[PDB]
Design a protein around this ligand. Structure first.
Ligand code: NDP
Ligand code: NDP
Ligand code: EA0
Ligand code: EA0
Lengths: 532, 526
């Protein structure tokens, strides 16, 4: 129709508005307040805004001239169209919008009332005529709310370039509720931090409810696994949403895409119990903790439990009773009479988990007795040592913390899943590799990502550094077969911008953290899923 | 010129022919007693089908509008090439068959199978035909003539990394004339390694803009991140497709030269460092022994046999002239380690001790430790054989209790093993990686190790996976690595273990053969 010929796109930025909370895309709808934007500066958004609304491709115009000239029977700049309130919100120093053909919709104002190089129009109709008579690359509709509403209603927008600002502000004007039959998300950017907020960038698309070295590629693929003998042929129709997306650049796709590779290419193995998994061997995920806290959004996660577990580690505790009194059941099943007995630990008290994480972190090499013993200045205090190496020998390549004490494996309730952490220091920034031997992608890994990201924050802080990358190496990476249905639901959910973690900044010692020193801000998440 | 207008490509496979310098000319064996030198290499024969038959009609109009202004492919043989084909397929599964000959007239074959008089009489035949591209199938004389008359554009060169008896040879491709632009993955077919290379003759997109927008933040407007120049990675940056597994190593060198953090180390030499890489090599298809420089494996095999024995006695190696642990056992080094009461070349409770006796009290390097501490090596073998789905098959050398007693903490933290469908894969996590000197030896060490465990458990080796923690290039290695990045790998050699060996403790140095190691010349990394 008219939207494809004239390439009329919309670009906006929406925050959450003043309102056990449910989240949909309508969560991000706040456009402005008291004639201006709800927020002071979000520079990264503003820079995106300029890059998109001023970018042209010289060479591509020729074919757009042809297309548009054909329909009418007949430096390069983009057009930008804005309501009069929007235009008035711009500071003088930036009027008219640089390196762009500015247009303004208005009834109360005519050319005579503007000093500046701008086209005025009183009709949506008048714009289409204007574009007909103009050389431009792309036409972007800048808002505000009234301009957005009518260009949508009139089926005129090809794509909505949409910034999710993952914070809340007082708002008096809102973006229109986008009909999900009309527009579908096809792209989601990396998540980022700017002016103390996370944000990403998503592109909604409308529906209708030297080519010599391109042949060389087809050749170097003469030996590929065809569509039929691709191990577990699970049905396309199931992952419709996941496969529709053109760009999957949200860091959560790092987890999601491993679920997919295991489902589509995983080896079928019956395991330790006689259950059933799909397994592969050797993955890596990287998460930029300076830009976001990678708590998964495609389902709900609570961190109270796993933060209690991490504080329990740092204290050197092996006593399951301490966590159960905090109503944290993460270790309950590994602590039962039935379980300790089946691990041949007949002479071990219930909930006495033996020389596990905590004990190995503060006392590696000390003889484990029972969970009540005072092990002070017994065994190597690994945690203290790596905090000292990071502080005094930051370039050291021996800042490992290790839980896999070979000597004590059979005395633990079960060997550590999370084998070791290596630390790395450059330019006052701390990164952390964690090697995981056995990873339940379905229940375990979401939490495992959350635990070591929080741990990197804690170490970084008490060493006067800034968290950089948390790097997660998976050994045996497996999906339980009864999790498959639940994971299908999950792969078809589109990630939201990650939240942020705040550490009480008065904590200067690794031991001095307590629950209330941990605040997750702006967790926007899909609905709880039982993997069972 | 003719060869770009008409699209004349050669397509050859060359094996090796009966110390030794290597270069591309190494590969030239074309045929023997009128047939191919080798019995059957079905992957190359499959590659041959695909490349010659493939057609893309949506790029033929662009060809049609250039060709005139001057659907199948044209395939050009020579009698003895046309002849040597077994009967039951002629013509070749739907291609425009064509034969250069002198004493063969176009009468006594069909009405599709166009014969030609001379080389100059083919340009005639093409201008009057409807074909995608033109493939010279060889053999010796055909290639010679078609190359001599600068008719060939690209060359689809299959490198057969095994030696055979040959009576005919591809010509020495002039490397100021032609040059390699693509190299494929390395493969095993019919008990040889091979790869596929390409010589070129020298000189909705709504979604394509969406790509550019998503890149709006990048720290690359061209500001020289590290003092490493463009024109120096010329050959490296002048390749389109770099799918040879050795590029996994080479691309880490590149990433760390381009984007690495400038750092002091203990020695003070200066490094570029990054943090967290994976490499995967397919042990079922090759032995990943770097080809872009000479590597020797006797020492590192003795090192491994020393580990398996449980030894911590640096002298057992020194008497075999394996000097890998010489520096780490000197009086001066042990003293800087605060190991004042440790005998020279007593390396303390390192790899071998930990693998065989983890948890045992280390005394000196001559004590008897029989049946003390945990014999992890024994334990992961039983687990592999008796519980292969176990996710607990780790061999860990990093013993926190004993670190300070070791000449140095293990560079190689742990091996984790994985078993599926009678196949064994291994991950080695390396806390600290010297990419220039160390890592190439480290890849070879644990690949061999992966084979040894595989064999004694009656499994086929699959993947060796190398996780690098602190990945550093020494500032004083950068010249050498610049020379190295602009070399093009050869197809990898293979490891043959003496099959009689069935327990991990029974391998001697004799039980290890490296085969078809075709390599560039030695580099002093200094
Ligand atoms: N490895 C590879 O990539 C390939 C190589 N081969 C091997 O190559 C070997 C053959 O090598 P080679 O002896 O050179 O055979 P060729 O394939 O070069 O065949 C030579 C024949 O082609 C004709 N011919 C040669 N020169 C001309 C010319 N200038 N104009 C017209 N016709 C010409 C015949 O003339 P005349 O009529 O007088 O006989 C001549 O006998 C075999 O062992 C074969 O298996 C096989 C296929 C490809
Ligand atoms: N967060 C974001 O992405 C963006 C934020 N905003 C914010 O939105 C607010 C402004 O939006 P809003 O108040 O809805 O107003 P608009 O910016 O949409 O301005 C509407 C006005 O434009 C004129 N107009 C609009 N449509 C027509 C038409 N079809 N024909 C003629 N004149 C027309 C009229 O001007 P007149 O009164 O002269 O008749 C009308 O009152 C501000 O707070 C601004 O900062 C705006 C853009 C982007
Ligand atoms: C900049 C902003 C809020 N972000 C996106 N993604 N898309 C928009 N429409 N934005 O508003 C731009 C606009 O129309 N107004 C505006 C306000 C101030 C200045 Cl300096 C420039 C433009
Ligand atoms: C098969 C071979 C050696 N490999 C490549 N890459 N390309 C060639 N030119 N090859 O030779 C094929 C050919 O021309 N002759 C031939 C020989 C046997 C049979 Cl079955 C079919 C064709």
């Amino acid at each position: 129709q008219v939207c494809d010929v004239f390439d009329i796109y919309a670009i906006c930025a929406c925050c959450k508005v003043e309102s056990n909370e449910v989240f949909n895309n309508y969560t991000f709808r706040g456009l402005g307040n008291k004639g201006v934007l709800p927020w002071k500066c979000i520079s990264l958004d503003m820079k995106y805004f300029r890059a998109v609304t001023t970018y042209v491709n010289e060479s591509k115009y020729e074919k757009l001239k042809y297309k548009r000239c054909k329909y009418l029977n007949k430096k390069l700049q983009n057009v930008v169209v804005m309501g009069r309130t929007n235009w008035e919100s711009i500071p003088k120093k930036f009027k008219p919008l640089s390196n762009r053909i500015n247009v303004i919709l208005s009834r109360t104002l005519k050319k005579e009332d503007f000093d500046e190089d701008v086209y005025i129009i009183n009709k949506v109709e008048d714009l289409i005529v204007l574009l007909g008579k103009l050389n431009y690359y792309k036409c972007f509709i800048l808002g505000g709310s009234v301009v957005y509403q009518e260009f949508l209603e009139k089926k005129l927008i090809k794509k909505i370039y949409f910034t999710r600002i993952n914070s809340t502000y007082e708002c008096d004007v809102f973006f229109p509720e986008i009909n999900e039959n009309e527009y579908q998300i096809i792209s989601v950017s990396d998540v980022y931090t700017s002016n103390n907020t996370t944000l990403d960038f998503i592109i909604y698309k409308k529906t209708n409810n030297d080519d010599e070295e391109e042949d060389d590629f087809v050749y170097f693929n003469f030996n590929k696994e065809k569509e039929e003998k691709n191990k577990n042929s699970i049905h396309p129709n199931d992952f419709q949403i996941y496969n529709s997306l053109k760009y999957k650049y949200h860091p959560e796709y790092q987890y999601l895409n491993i679920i997919y590779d295991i489902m589509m290419n995983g080896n079928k193995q019956s395991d330790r119990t006689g259950v059933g998994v799909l397994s592969k061997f050797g993955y890596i995920m990287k998460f930029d903790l300076s830009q976001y806290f990678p708590l998964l959004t495609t389902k709900k996660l609570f961190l109270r439990g796993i933060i209690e577990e991490l504080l329990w580690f740092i204290r050197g505790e092996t006593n399951g009773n301490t966590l159960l009194n905090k109503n944290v059941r993460i270790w309950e099943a590994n602590g039962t009479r039935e379980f300790l007995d089946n691990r041949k630990l007949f002479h071990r008290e219930v909930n006495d988990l033996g020389p596990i994480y905590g004990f190995q972190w503060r006392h590696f090499g000390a003889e484990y007795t029972n969970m009540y013993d005072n092990y002070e200045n017994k065994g190597v205090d690994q945690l203290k040592n790596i905090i000292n190496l990071i502080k005094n020998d930051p370039t050291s390549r021996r800042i490992l913390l290790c839980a896999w004490n070979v000597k004590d494996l059979d005395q633990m309730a079960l060997p550590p899943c999370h084998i070791l952490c290596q630390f790395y220091v450059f330019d006052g920034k701390l990164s952390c590799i964690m090697y995981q031997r056995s990873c339940d992608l379905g229940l375990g890994v979401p939490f495992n990502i959350a635990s070591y990201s929080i741990f990197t924050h804690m170490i970084a802080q008490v060493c006067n550094l800034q968290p950089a990358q948390f790097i997660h190496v998976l050994g045996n990476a497996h999906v339980y077969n009864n999790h498959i249905d639940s994971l299908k639901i999950q792969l078809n959910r589109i990630p939201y911008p990650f939240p942020t973690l705040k550490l009480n900044p008065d904590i200067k010692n690794i031991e001095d953290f307590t629950i209330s020193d941990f605040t997750i801000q702006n967790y926007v998440h899909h609905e709880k899923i039982s993997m069972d």
